[PDB]
PDB file of C-alpha atoms and ligand atoms in Angstrom:
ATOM      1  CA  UNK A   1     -82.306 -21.519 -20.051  1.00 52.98           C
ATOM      2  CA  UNK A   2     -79.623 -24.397 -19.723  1.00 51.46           C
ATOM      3  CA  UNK A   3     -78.378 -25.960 -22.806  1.00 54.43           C
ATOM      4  CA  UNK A   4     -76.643 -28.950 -21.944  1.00 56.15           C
ATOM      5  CA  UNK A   5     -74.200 -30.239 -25.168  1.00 55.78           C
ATOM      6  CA  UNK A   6     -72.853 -33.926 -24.936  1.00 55.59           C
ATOM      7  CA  UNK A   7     -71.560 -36.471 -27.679  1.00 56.76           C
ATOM      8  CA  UNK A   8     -68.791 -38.482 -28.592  1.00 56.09           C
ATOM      9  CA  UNK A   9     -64.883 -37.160 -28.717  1.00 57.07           C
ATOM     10  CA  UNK A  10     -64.296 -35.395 -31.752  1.00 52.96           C
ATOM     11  CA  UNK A  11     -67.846 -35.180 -32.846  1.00 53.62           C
ATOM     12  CA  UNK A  12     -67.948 -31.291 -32.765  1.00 52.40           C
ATOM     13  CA  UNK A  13     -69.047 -29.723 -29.561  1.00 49.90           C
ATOM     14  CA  UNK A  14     -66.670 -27.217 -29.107  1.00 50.06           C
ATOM     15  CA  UNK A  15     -67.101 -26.498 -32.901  1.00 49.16           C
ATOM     16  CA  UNK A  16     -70.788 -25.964 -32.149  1.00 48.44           C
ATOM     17  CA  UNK A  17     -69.781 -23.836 -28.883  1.00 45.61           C
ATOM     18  CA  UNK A  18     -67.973 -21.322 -31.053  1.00 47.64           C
ATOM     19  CA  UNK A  19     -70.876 -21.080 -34.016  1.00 49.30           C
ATOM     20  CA  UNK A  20     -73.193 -20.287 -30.807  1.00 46.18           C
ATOM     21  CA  UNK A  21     -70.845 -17.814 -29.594  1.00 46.77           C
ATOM     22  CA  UNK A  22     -70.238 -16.070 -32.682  1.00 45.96           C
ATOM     23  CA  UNK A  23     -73.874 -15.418 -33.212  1.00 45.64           C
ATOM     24  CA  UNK A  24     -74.432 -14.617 -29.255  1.00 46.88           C
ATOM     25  CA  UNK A  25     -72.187 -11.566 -29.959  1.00 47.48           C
ATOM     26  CA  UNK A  26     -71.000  -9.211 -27.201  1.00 44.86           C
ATOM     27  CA  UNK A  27     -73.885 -11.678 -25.066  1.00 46.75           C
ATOM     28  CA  UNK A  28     -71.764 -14.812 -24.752  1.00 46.37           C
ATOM     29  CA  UNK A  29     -68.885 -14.257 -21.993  1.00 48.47           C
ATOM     30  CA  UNK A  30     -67.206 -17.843 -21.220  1.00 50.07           C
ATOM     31  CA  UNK A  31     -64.654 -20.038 -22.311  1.00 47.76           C
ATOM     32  CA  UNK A  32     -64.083 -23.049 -24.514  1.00 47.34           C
ATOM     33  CA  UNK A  33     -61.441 -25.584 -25.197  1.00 46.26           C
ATOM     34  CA  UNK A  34     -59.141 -26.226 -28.157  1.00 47.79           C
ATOM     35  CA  UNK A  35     -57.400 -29.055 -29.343  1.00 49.45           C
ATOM     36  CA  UNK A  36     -53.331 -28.421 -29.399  1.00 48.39           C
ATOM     37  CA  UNK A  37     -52.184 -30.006 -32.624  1.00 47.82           C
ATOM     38  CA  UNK A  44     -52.958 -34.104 -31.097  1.00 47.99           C
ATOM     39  CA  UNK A  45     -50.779 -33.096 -27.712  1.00 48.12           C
ATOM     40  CA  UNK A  46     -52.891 -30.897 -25.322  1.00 49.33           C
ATOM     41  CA  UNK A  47     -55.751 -28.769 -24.988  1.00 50.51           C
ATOM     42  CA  UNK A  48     -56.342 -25.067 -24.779  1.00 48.96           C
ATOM     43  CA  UNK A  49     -58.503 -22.801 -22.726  1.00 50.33           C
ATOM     44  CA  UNK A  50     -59.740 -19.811 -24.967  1.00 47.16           C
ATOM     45  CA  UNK A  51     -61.741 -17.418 -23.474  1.00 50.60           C
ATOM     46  CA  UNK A  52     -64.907 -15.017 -25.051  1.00 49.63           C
ATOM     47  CA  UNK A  53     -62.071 -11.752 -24.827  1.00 48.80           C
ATOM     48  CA  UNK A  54     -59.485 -14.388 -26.526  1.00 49.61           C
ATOM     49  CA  UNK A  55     -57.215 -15.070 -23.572  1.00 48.61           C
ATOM     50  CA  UNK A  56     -55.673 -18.727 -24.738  1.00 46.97           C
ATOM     51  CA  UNK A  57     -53.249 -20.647 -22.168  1.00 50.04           C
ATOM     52  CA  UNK A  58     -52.653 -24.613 -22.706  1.00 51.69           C
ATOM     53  CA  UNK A  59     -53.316 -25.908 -19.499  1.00 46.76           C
ATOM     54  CA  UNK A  60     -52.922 -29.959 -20.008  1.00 47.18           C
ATOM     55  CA  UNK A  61     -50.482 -31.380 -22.338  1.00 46.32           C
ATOM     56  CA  UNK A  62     -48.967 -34.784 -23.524  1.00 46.10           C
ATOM     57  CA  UNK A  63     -45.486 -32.771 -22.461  1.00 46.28           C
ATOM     58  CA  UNK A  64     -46.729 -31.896 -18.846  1.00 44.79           C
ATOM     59  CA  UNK A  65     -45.655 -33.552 -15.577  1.00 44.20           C
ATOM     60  CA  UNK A  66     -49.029 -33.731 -13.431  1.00 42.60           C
ATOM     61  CA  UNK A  67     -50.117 -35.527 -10.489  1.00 45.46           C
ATOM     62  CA  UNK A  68     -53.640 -34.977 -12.263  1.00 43.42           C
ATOM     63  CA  UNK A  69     -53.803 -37.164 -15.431  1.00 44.12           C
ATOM     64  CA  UNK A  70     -56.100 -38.396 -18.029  1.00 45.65           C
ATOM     65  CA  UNK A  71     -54.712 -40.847 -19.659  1.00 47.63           C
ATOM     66  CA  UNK A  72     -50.617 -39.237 -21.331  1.00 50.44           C
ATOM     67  CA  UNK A  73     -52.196 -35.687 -20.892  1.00 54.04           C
ATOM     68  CA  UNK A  74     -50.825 -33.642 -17.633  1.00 56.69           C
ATOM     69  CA  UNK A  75     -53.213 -31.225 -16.118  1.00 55.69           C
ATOM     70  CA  UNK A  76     -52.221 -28.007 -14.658  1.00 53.84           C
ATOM     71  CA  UNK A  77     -55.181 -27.342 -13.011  1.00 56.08           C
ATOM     72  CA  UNK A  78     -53.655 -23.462 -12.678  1.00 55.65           C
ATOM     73  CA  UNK A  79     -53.301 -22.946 -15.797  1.00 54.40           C
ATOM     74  CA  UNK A  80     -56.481 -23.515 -16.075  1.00 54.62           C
ATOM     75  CA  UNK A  81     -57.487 -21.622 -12.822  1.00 56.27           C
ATOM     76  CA  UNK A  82     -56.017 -18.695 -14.048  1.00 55.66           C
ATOM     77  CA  UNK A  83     -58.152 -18.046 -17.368  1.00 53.63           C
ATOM     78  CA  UNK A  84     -60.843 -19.951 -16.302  1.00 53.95           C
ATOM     79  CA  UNK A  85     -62.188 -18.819 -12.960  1.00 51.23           C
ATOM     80  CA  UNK A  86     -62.099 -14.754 -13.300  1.00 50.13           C
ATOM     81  CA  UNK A  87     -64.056 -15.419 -16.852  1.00 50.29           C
ATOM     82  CA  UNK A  88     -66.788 -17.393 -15.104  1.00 46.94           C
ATOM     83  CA  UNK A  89     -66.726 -15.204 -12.051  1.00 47.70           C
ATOM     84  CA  UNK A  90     -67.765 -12.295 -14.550  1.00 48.97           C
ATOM     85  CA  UNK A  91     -69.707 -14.181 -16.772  1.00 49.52           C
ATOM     86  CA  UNK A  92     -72.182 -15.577 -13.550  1.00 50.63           C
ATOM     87  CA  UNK A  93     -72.369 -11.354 -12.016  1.00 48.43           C
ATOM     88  CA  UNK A  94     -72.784 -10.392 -15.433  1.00 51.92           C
ATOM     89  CA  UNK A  95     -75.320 -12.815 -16.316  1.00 50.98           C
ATOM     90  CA  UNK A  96     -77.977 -12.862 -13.032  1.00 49.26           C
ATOM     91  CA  UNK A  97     -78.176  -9.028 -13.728  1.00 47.63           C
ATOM     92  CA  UNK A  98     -78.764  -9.064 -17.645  1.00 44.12           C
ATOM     93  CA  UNK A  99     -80.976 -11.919 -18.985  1.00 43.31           C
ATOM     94  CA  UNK A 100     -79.675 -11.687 -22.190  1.00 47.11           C
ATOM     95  CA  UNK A 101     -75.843 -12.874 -21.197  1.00 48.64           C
ATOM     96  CA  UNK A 102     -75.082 -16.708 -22.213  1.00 52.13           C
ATOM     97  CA  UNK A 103     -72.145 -18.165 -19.724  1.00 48.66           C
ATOM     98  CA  UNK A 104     -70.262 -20.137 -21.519  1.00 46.71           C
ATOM     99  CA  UNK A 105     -68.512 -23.621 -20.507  1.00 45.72           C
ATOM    100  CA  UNK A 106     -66.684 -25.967 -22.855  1.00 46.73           C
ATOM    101  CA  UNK A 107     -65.991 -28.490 -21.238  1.00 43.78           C
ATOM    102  CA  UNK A 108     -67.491 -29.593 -17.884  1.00 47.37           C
ATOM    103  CA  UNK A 109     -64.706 -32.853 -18.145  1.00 48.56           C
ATOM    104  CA  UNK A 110     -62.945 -34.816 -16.474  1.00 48.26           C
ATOM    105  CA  UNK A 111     -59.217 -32.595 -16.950  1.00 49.03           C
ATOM    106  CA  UNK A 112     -61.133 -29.482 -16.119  1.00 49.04           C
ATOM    107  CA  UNK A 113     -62.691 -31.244 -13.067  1.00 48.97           C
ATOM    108  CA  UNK A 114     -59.540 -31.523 -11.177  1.00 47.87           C
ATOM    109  CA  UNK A 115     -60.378 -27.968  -9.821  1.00 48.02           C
ATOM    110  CA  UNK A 116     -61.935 -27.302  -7.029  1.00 47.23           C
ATOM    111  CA  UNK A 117     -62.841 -23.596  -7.645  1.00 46.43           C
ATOM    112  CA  UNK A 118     -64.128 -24.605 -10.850  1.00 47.19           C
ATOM    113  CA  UNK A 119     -66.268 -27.625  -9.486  1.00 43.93           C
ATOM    114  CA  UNK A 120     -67.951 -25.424  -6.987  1.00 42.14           C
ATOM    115  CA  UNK A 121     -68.434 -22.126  -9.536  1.00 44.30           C
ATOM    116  CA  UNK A 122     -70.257 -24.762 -11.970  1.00 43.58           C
ATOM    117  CA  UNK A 123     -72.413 -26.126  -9.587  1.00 41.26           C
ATOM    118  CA  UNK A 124     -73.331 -22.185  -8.178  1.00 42.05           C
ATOM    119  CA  UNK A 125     -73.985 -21.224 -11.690  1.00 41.48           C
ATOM    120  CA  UNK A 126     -75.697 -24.490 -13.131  1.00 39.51           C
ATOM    121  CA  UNK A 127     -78.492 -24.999 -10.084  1.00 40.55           C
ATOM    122  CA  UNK A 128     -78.643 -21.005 -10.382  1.00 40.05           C
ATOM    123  CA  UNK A 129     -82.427 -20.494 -12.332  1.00 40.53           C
ATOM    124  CA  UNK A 130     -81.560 -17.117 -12.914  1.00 39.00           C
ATOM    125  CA  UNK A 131     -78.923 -17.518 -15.445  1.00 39.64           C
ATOM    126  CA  UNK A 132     -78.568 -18.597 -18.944  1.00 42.44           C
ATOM    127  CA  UNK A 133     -76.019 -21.327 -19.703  1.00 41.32           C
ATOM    128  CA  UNK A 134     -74.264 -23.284 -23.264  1.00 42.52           C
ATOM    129  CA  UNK A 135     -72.284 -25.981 -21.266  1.00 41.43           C
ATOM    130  CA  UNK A 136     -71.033 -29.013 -22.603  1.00 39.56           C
ATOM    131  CA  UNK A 137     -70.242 -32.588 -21.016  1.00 39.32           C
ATOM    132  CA  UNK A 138     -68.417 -35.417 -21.980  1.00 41.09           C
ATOM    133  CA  UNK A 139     -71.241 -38.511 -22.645  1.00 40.31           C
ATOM    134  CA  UNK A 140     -69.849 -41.030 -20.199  1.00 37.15           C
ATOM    135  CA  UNK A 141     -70.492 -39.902 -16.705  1.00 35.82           C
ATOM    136  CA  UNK A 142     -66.876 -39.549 -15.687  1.00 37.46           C
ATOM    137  CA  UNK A 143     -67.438 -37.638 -12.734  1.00 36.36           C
ATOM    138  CA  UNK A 144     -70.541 -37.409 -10.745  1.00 38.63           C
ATOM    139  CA  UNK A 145     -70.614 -33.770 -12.111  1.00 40.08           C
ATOM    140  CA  UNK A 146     -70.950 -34.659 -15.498  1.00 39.56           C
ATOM    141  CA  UNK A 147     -73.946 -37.386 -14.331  1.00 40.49           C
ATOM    142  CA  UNK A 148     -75.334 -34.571 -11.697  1.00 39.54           C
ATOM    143  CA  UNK A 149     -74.974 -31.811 -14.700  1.00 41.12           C
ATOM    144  CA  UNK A 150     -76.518 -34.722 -16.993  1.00 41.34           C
ATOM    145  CA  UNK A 151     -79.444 -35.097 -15.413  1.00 40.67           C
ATOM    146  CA  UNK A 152     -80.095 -31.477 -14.213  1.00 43.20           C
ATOM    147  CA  UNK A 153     -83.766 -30.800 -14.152  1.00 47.06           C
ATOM    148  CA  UNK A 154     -85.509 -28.218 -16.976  1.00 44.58           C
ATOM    149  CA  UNK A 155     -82.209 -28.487 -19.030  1.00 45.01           C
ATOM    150  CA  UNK A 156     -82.018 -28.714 -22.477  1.00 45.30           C
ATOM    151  CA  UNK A 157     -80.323 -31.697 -23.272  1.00 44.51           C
ATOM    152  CA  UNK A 158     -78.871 -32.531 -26.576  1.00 42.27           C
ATOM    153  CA  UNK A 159     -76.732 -35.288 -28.181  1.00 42.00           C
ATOM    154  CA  UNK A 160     -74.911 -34.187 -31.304  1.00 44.77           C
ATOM    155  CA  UNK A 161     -73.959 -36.647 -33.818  1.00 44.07           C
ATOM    156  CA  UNK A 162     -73.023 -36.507 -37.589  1.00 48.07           C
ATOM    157  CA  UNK A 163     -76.253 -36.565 -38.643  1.00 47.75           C
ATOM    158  CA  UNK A 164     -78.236 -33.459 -36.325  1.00 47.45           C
ATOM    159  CA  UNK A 165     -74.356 -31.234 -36.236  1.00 46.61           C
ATOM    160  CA  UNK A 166     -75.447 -29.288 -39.330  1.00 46.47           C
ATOM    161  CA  UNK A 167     -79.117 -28.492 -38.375  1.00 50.16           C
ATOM    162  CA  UNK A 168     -79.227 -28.147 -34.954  1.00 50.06           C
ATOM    163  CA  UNK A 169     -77.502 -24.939 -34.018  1.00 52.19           C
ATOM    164  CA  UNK A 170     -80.871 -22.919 -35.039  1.00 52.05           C
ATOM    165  CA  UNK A 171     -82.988 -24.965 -32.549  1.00 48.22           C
ATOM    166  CA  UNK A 172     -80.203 -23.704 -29.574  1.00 47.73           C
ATOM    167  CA  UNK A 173     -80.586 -20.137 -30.832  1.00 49.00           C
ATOM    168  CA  UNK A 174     -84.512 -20.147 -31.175  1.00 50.37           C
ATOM    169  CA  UNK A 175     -84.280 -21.494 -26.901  1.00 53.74           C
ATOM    170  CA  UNK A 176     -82.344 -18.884 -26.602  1.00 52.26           C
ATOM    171  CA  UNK A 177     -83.560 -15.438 -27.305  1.00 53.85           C
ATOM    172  CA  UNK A 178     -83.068 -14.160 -30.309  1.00 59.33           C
TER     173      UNK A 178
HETATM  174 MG1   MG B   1     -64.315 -30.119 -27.525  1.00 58.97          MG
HETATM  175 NA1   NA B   2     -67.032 -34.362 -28.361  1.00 56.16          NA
HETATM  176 NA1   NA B   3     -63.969 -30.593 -31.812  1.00 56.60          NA
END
């Protein structure tokens, strides 16, 4: 099962990540990504590792918009979580990886690009990802349109309700 979160900035999809990990229990293993307050983002993982990995205060070659990206940084959380989270998961069906956000800052790296695709076009696996709703980078559109997925848009009006529909998908 692929659940496939995309919306609007700020609407609350990393909000909704952490409701779905809290109820997944010792079953979600992943990561998700925190505002800094607005001047950077964090990378907290499911055993509550936390690094800031691209900041407003950050020199980068790799950019979006004022925000510098340290792409190991974000390596350095990042990669051994999934790593465990994708062995983990093929042998018990009852693991959730975890991935918030498939964007464009956390797209910069290479390891990651290639562990997402292995783990995403993997059937055997269950998967909450998240991706930004404009297809800025043909990951997000590939991830977008990635066949059996669940794909759903949050928005004001379904944030509230639709957590229980993700969780009935999912096993209880
Ligand atoms: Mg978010
Ligand atoms: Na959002
Ligand atoms: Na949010």
């Amino acid at each position: 099962m692929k659940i496939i979160i995309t919306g609007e900035p700020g609407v609350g999809k990393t909000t909704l990540v952490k409701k779905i990990v809290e109820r997944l229990g010792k079953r979600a293993i992943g990561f998700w990504t925190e505002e800094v307050r607005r001047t950077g983002f964090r990378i907290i993982t499911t055993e509550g590792k936390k690094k800031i990995f691209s900041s407003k205060f950050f020199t980068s070659k790799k950019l979006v918009g004022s925000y510098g990206v340290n792409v190991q940084y974000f390596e350095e959380l990042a990669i051994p979580i999934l790593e465990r989270a994708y062995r983990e998961a093929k042998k018990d069906r009852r693991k959730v990886i975890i991935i918030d956000e498939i964007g464009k800052m956390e797209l910069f790296s290479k390891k990651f690009r290639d562990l997402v695709r292995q783990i995403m076009h993997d059937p055997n696996v269950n998967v909450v990802a998240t991706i930004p709703i404009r297809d800025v980078h043909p990951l997000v559109k590939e991830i977008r349109r990635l066949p059996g997925a669940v794909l759903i848009e949050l928005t004001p009006e379904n944030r509230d309700v639709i957590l229980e529909d993700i969780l009935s998908l999912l096993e209880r």
